A = this chain, B = another copy of it.
Amino acid sequence: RFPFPVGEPDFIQGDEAIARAAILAGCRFYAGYPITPASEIFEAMALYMPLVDGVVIQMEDEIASIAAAIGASWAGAKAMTATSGPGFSLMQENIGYAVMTETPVVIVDVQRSGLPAQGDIMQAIWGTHGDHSLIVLSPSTVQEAFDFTIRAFNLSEKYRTPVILLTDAEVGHMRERVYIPNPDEIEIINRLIKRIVEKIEKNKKDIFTYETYELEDAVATGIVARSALLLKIETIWPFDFELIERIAERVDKLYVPEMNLGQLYHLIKEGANGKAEVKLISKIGGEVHTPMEIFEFI
């Protein structure tokens, strides 16, 4: 009994795909605030969630926003928050905390400029205090935003960890085609710091996920994969370093275009054990890479 179309193609935005995906995954607690460009995730939840006997909690404070979800999670709910920019910085203690408690919870960081951007890749990985491991996923299309949100809620439960869906304003706002399956076509997974880290890092084979098929060629993520279309980075963390190694050997140079000053780049160069030149095509300040721009540069 879902208040949106299921079992059929539809044309939705990112924020809406996420908000639909979450609900089908089992999430009946959302805690957030209307802020651009997450405020559409909010509106969708605010619209849909009361009609599925779920609850939306409009919290002022990002600190409070994430804490309420950790709290709903512990009282049994599947739960999510959503934020942007320096809000995401505010949530790092409670995220860190959710790591140690092995709390299932999903966080959406909708990246932004000031207009998409890709400058929270490292903070998504290392912003927590201490030794920790959590999962970070990066959607390149509106269909991936739908699918990864499902996967996030599934991973969050299976590995009893927070999951970060790391996206951008453009994927979030741009309308595209999403096939939304019927409820029962969807597998949903029901419900010291050495095992915590190993929980994640020893299972990259299950949690890591990449797209790329050019075995006969001489790497990006998010809204920059679509304009670079190539190695597709979907699972940002835990990160398969060896895979980048194997690909280093089989090619001459590895171009890493990002909307930052080098973050995805670093993991690539550390991945490529010297066995290929690694270069960054950085654009920042608003526009995604136009494919002519990535084109020329190479």
Q: Chain A: residues with CB nearer than 8 A to chain B?
A: 28-29, 31, 55, 57, 59-61, 63-77, 79, 85-90, 92-94, 96-97, 101, 117, 119-120, 122-123, 125-131, 193-194, 197, 260-261, 266, 269-270, 272-275, 284
Number of copies: 4
- Which residues of B are found within 8 Å of A59, using beta-carbon distances? 67, 94, 97
Q: Which of B28, B31, B96, B269 interacts with A89 by CB under 8 Å?
A: B96
Assembled-state Cα–Cα distance A68/B70 (Å): 6
Assembled-state Cα–Cα distance A27/B274 (Å): 45
Question: What distance in Å separates the Cβ of A7 from its nearest Cβ neighbour in chain B?
Answer: 29
Assembled-state Cα–Cα distance A79/B79 (Å): 17
CB-based contact B69/A86 at 8 Å: no
CB-based contact A127/B92 at 8 Å: yes
CB-based contact B129/A85 at 8 Å: yes
- Which residues of B are found within 8 Å of A101, using beta-carbon distances? 57
CB-based contact B74/A57 at 8 Å: yes
Q: Which of B63, B76, B85 interacts with A67 by CB under 8 Å?
A: B63
- Measured CB to CB, the nearest residue on chain B to A198 is B261
List 22 contacting pairs A-B, 8 Å CB cutoff, sorted by A.
A29-B74, A31-B71, A55-B74, A57-B74, A57-B101, A59-B94, A60-B97, A61-B63, A64-B64, A64-B67, A67-B67, A67-B71, A71-B71, A71-B79, A73-B75, A90-B93, A123-B129, A131-B261, A194-B284, A197-B261, A272-B274, A274-B274
Question: What distance in Å separates the Cβ of A109 from its nearest Cβ neighbour in chain B?
Answer: 9
- Which residues of B are found within 8 Å of A126, using beta-carbon distances? 122-123, 125-127
- Which residues of B are found within 8 Å of A128, using beta-carbon distances? 89, 123
CB-based contact A60/B79 at 8 Å: no
In the A-B complex, the 10 residue pairs with the smallest Cβ-Cβ separation, listed nearest first, are: A274-B274, A68-B71, A71-B71, A64-B67, A270-B270, A75-B77, A122-B126, A273-B274, A72-B75, A89-B93
Not counting A59-B67, A90-B90, A274-B275, a sample of 16 additional A-B residue pairs whose C-beta atoms are within 8 angstroms of each other reads A31-B71, A60-B90, A63-B63, A63-B64, A69-B71, A70-B71, A75-B77, A86-B129, A89-B129, A92-B123, A123-B130, A127-B127, A131-B260, A266-B270, A269-B270, A273-B273
CB-based contact A70/B57 at 8 Å: yes
- Which residues of B are found within 8 Å of A64, using beta-carbon distances? 63-64, 66-67, 93-94
- Which residues of B are found within 8 Å of A72, using beta-carbon distances? 71-72, 74-75
CB-based contact A92/B89 at 8 Å: yes
- Which residues of B are found within 8 Å of A86, using beta-carbon distances? 60, 93, 96-97, 129
Assembled-state Cα–Cα distance A284/B193 (Å): 9
- Which residues of B are found within 8 Å of A284, using beta-carbon distances? 131, 193-194
- Measured CB to CB, the nearest residue on chain B to A126 is B122
- Which residues of B are found within 8 Å of A272, using beta-carbon distances? 274
